[PDB]
Amino acid sequence: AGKKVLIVYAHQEPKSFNGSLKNVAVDELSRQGCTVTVSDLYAMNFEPRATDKDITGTLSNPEVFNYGVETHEAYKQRSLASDITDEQKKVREADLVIFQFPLYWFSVPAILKGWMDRVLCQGFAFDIPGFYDSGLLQGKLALLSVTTGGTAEMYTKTGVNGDSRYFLWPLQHGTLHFCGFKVLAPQISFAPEIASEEERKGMVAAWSQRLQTIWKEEPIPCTAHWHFGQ
Amino acid sequence: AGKKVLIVYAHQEPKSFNGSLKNVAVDELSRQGCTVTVSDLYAMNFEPRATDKDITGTLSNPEVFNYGVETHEAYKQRSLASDITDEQKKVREADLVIFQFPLYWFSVPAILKGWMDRVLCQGFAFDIPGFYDSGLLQGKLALLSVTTGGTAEMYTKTGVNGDSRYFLWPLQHGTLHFCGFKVLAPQISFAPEIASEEERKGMVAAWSQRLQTIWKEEPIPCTAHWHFGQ
């Protein structure tokens, strides 16, 4: 038995609604007997910028810096910065990776975009021919637990923001599926700032309730059809 | 001429293809007599993280930190960190804002995502109400000049990556249109790393050539249909 879960958390305030969702996930998964690790990006002051400091020692081409090539070579030569490799070890061992974050401009907050940019490097998360279905992190599950400022109605086909699946494409398909992750249906907690205490306590309970059978869930068919089709 | 242009540039290497696209933009707009400013994010070591350090005055709610609320109030009070206000001044004066960057996970590099998260704050870029066609940056034009690793064929409805327009949604609609920007058609320079010299020079000249008549262009209809069709 036993499963390992990594929660990559991106919120500045422990008392926030995101903080409560993160804490409920830790509590429930821990109660189930799961091995749980949390990467609290803001508390770690995680570096988001992709720079040459991500490679220790000497570059393979110090004349013209190419981040993708340098990190690919550094990964193979075990020469990546320790913050990056500390994260890859957590991801390598994880059976499920949960990303907990507030939607920032239809996407992840920059600190979490930086985690994706620097941690999921070529050789570790993908390569030729390991991508999408054959991505290097195949066999692992991933799930986006997002909170929004806009209401559910706003995120409908005819709402101003359009369908939620529209902004999910770059994250779910372009990133998670690309690295070989089987993607579980997103958990979207719509406009918690607006909601009442009851509705709030209700979205948290739904999440805690869903986590009870998380290992029984089937991955979504990560296709353009799923995100855009009828 | 008679126009102000801000180029927000996100690439670590001056000698890169992105660097050349940024340089030809400066050269061509400068030749036209336009006023040009470049925010070279990596050279500026631009801070991507949205933290409480972005507000220098008394917080409105020091018990529970809410970045959106605190930055909205700090904007009105003029207590935002100076790096944010320096960027807001550049955007305020610009008639056209060009974003020059390599696609990272179907989106902008984290350093540029941080610029969007921190610079486009409530009160400055939008207000509630006061977004989309009523956004605060209405009247201004925006354009994404993106480079990719994947080829144009990969970026089609039947390609592995799906149509390129799918990944532009969060950026063009969720961010730029949301703030009131008119969005000009994206400049996408496909897979310059695997292209031949003839092809690269060609992509650079195509961009330079396009800039010659940029002021005569009409914005795209930034809608779900334009992005997803059907």
Ligand SMILES: Cc1cc2nc3c(=O)[nH]c(=O)nc-3n(C[C@H](O)[C@H](O)[C@H](O)COP(=O)(O)OP(=O)(O)OC[C@H]3O[C@@H](n4cnc5c(N)ncnc54)[C@H](O)[C@@H]3O)c2cc1C
């Ligand atoms: C830079 C930036 C860009 C943004 N862009 C977007 C965007 O693209 N689209 C969009 O829709 N939104 C956007 N937003 C809004 C953002 O997504 C929401 O503000 C965020 O998701 C709200 O989540 P939170 O955890 O911060 O809420 P909080 O304010 O922390 O919490 C909401 C309420 O829940 C209470 N609460 C906390 N825990 C519990 C609990 N266990 N039970 C009951 N109540 C609890 C809190 O105390 C509070 O009153 C953006 C915000 C910023 C700052």
Ligand SMILES: Cc1cc2nc3c(=O)[nH]c(=O)nc-3n(C[C@H](O)[C@H](O)[C@H](O)COP(=O)(O)OP(=O)(O)OC[C@H]3O[C@@H](n4cnc5c(N)ncnc54)[C@H](O)[C@@H]3O)c2cc1C
């Ligand atoms: C973290 C990360 C995530 C990524 N995710 C994605 C993704 O989601 N999807 C995707 O498609 N790609 C992705 N990529 C790939 C990335 O988008 C490309 O590597 C990038 O767009 C290439 O641009 P460049 O400026 O770095 O090219 P360069 O490495 O500079 O290559 C272009 C070539 O052109 C030459 N050149 C420069 N200027 C000129 C000139 N004036 N005339 C002629 N030739 C010139 C250069 O010397 C070089 O050999 C990712 C890369 C990283 C590092």
Ligand SMILES: COc1ccc2[nH]cc(CCNC(C)=O)c2c1
């Ligand atoms: C090096 O870093 C990355 C990271 C994530 C990525 N997604 C897609 C690409 C490029 C794909 N290129 C080709 C020619 O197949 C990519 C590169």
Ligand SMILES: COc1ccc2[nH]cc(CCNC(C)=O)c2c1
């Ligand atoms: C969709 O774009 C954004 C961008 C920055 C934002 N800050 C706060 C909010 C939530 C307020 N209501 C809306 C319009 O969702 C927000 C939304």
Ligand SMILES: [Zn+2]
């Ligand atoms: Zn997919």
Ligand SMILES: [Zn+2]
């Ligand atoms: Zn739009």
